[model samples]
Target: GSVLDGPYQPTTFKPPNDYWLLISSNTDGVVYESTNNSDFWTAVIAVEPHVSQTNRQYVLFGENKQFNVENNSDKWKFFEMFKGSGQSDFSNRRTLTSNNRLVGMLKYGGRVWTFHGETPRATTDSSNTADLNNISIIIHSEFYIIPRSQESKCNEYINNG
Candidate 1:
């Protein structure tokens, strides 16, 4: 709580363990688990009992509680769009060491990312896992990282912030 500030405090990021990963999709749902891999941890689709659901919502878990969608949806841009090497525009995208490819928020399709039915699936020549995915993936969609808790809901109000 201390900053020798001109405007205010410096920016900081929450560590993975304290926050749950909530993905907002327009189609189906998928689950990913952080696994023991090299510097680059590639995430794959898998389940652990009640970890995954069929509602096309709620993806990963956190190390704490009392969190929900609103607080978690604070414009945390997780993925980026890929631009061909020959091109250099604002369409720059890259994330997760294992899957060093173009990553978008959730608005499109691709074989680099395709889904089984509405269930999204991704690949990058490995079977590793981590804290995050692909296109063809969402048909048409957008992803968001929300707060996590033992219990929560998606009810929020507008013009009240």
Candidate 2:
């Protein structure tokens, strides 16, 4: 389900702002993690461009699914190595040599992981895949926002940081 309002905080870090943002805990938001039937966990966090299509259509449709960089650029830098997955289309992946940042948005069991880090690389083997259970994603994009709200309180309860 999607959280619509406030009272957001990080379990470890105290958020410093209050903004109306969204987070999906059920594969509808930016990042999603799930435990396989055998107890192992798998997750996907999409890496987006600085300015998404001028219309933000991808933001609307790219929800709930795991993704990687969609375009090639020498500006976003090595931001691909942070997403736990490399560029989705490696044939056209480009590399930059600066400290530029990329943003990642995702919803966990009941919290939001919004932070910045350099780009991420795609995991090639099962052992190399991201450990969603203990993964910490960073979104260096200055505009990234951390959420501190919980939704659907009537049917269930959650704890905020």
Candidate 3:
């Protein structure tokens, strides 16, 4: 069956397999998945008044024994908009690579670095200046790297199916 096949309504996202993909509208409020069934219904009550039941395309890929809308009506930000002292202005964005799924690379002030689990890897430099013309490096998004078990299943499905 096609991954994009319809029946896109709000519903449980469980599959026969241990892990599966979950997709929903981006702004149809928020969807949460729990490890069990009754918990999901209880979670439904937690959704707040301001959250609207609208239609937007959103998708999540993971295991799900239970799924429901659970928002407290409070708005939140995943990343901070303002930077404090000693914080780099370039903190908002990140660079990813295929070779290292756990580490992300970033460059600022002519220095190149890779961040791993919030820790930084060895840094390379093109002098302590703003000019980055001399450094040659490629940046990519780590989002491409599927987790191990899922990637294994995906590869097997692709090869034998």
* Candidate achieving the largest TM-score: 3
Where's the lowest-lDDT run of ten residues in candidate 1? 152-161
Evaluated with lDDT, which candidate comes out highest? 2
**Candidate 3 lDDT by residue in tens digits, 1-161:** 23323333444423222222222212222233212221111110112234454322322222122222322334311110111222222122221111111221123343422221111222211112233333222111111222324434333322222
Misplaced by over 4 Å in model 3 are: 37-161
Q: Candidate 1's residue-wise lDDT over 1-161, tens digit each?
A: 02111121221222233222222322212222232222222122221222222322333222121111111221211222222222222221232211111121211122122111111232221222232221112212222332323112211100010
Backbone clashes under 3 angstroms, per model? 5, 30, 3
Query: Candidate 1, TM-score vs. the true structure?
Result: 0.19
Task: Show the colliding residue pairs in model 1.
Answer: 80-103, 106-141, 109-136, 110-136, 113-135
Sorted on TM-score, best first, the list reads 3, 2, 1
Model 1 per-residue lDDT at 62: 24
Prediction RMSDs, each to the true structure: 18.3, 14.8, 18.8
